[PDB]
Ligand binder design. Structure first.
Ligand SMILES: CC(C)(COP(=O)(O)OP(=O)(O)OC[C@H]1O[C@@H](n2cnc3c(N)ncnc32)[C@H](O)[C@@H]1OP(=O)(O)O)[C@@H](O)C(=O)NCCC(=O)NCCS
Ligand SMILES: CC(C)(COP(=O)(O)OP(=O)(O)OC[C@H]1O[C@@H](n2cnc3c(N)ncnc32)[C@H](O)[C@@H]1OP(=O)(O)O)[C@@H](O)C(=O)NCCC(=O)NCCS
Ligand SMILES: [Ca+2]
Ligand SMILES: [Ca+2]
Ligand SMILES: [Ca+2]
Ligand SMILES: [Ca+2]
Lengths: 143, 143
């Protein structure tokens, strides 16, 4: 329950063929996570996103992005399920979402100190993220 | 060419009655700024935005936001024209755009060290912003 290969991971940028039943297992460590159904809606409302799927259709990594298509984009969420980390998938998802976004002037995201090096190795630079967290709505605004 | 009052500043969240001719004077300090026509398109593509206007219809402050309406939003641009700063307008624009966004779990933005206190006084907290700047496209992706 340990050996892995990225060789039969496939990527897609639509929800065609993806059900909420295939979006379970995310939000590791979140106290009150969006459900898989809510994740599906989050993806549907993103400007762009990238999914990494095993052959059975389970989504084991994703990234989403907000964008105006003209000047700016931001990347709210990036996650690879723990058994699939350390293979380069997170970096690959980031490269793929940047391709989907195009060469916009600004692409920005927030992170904690521990993951700064992950992002620096992708070429991102570091400034201040000012933020709000409305923890009552951590599971998402309902439909 | 110095006295000001916010008393006849009006706010709006649509482009009704706003022309590109009324969106001049922004991007102070930018080497290759979006034109007013491009700014109009940026606003039109935002999830939400707030404009501050004088009685003649000139826009003298704005803020925009990207959002998925479910979990996350980000604020790419905030600017008040220099003769209108130091009256509370920037803070007011921020409060108004947060109202337009609603109580989403995440609201995030990037900034330099100098403006951190402005954002802390609005209740925002500080983390790392990881970012890319594609300076060739500073004036925006064309229509
Ligand atoms: C960050 C994340 C997406 C990286 O995915 P990944 O597929 O392992 O990415 P890569 O294989 O390209 O890079 C992995 C490297 O990133 C670094 N890294 C990732 N998370 C780290 C952390 N929390 N602390 C320290 N280093 C970290 C490590 O150098 C790691 O290499 P290692 O496995 O040899 O230690 C993954 O760790 C994850 O899903 N974490 C939980 C959610 C998260 O923190 N996402 C970031 C936005 S909040
Ligand atoms: C940041 C900005 C929007 C604030 O607008 P404003 O209408 O003056 O906002 P407020 O009146 O609510 O707050 C002003 C206070 O913010 C702080 N502040 C704003 N910019 C600052 C800066 N560059 N360095 C230090 N303090 C700053 C000061 O405390 C200032 O008070 P002061 O005029 O008495 O010195 C305005 O300075 C601006 O348009 N700057 C250029 C664009 C920008 O930096 N926007 C931020 C996103 S990049
Ligand atoms: Ca879509
Ligand atoms: Ca490894
Ligand atoms: Ca609109
Ligand atoms: Ca003042």
């Amino acid at each position: 329950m340990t050996q892995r290969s990225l060789a039969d991971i496939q990527f897609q940028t639509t929800l065609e063929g993806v059900t909420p039943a295939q979006l379970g297992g995310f939000f590791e460590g979140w106290p009150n996570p969006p459900t898989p159904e809510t994740l599906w809606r989050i993806l549907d409302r993103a400007a762009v996103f990238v999914l990494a799927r095993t052959p059975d259709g389970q989504v084991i990594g994703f990234v989403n992005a907000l964008s105006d298509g003209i000047l700016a984009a931001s990347i709210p969420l990036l996650e690879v399920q723990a058994g699939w980390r350390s293979l380069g998938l997170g970096s690959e998802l980031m490269r793929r979402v940047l391709t989907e976004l195009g060469d916009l002037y600004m692409v920005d995201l927030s992170c904690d100190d521990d993951v700064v090096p992950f992002y620096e190795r992708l070429g991102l630079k570091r400034a201040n993220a000012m933020f709000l967290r409305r923890y009552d709505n951590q599971a998402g605004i309902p439909a």
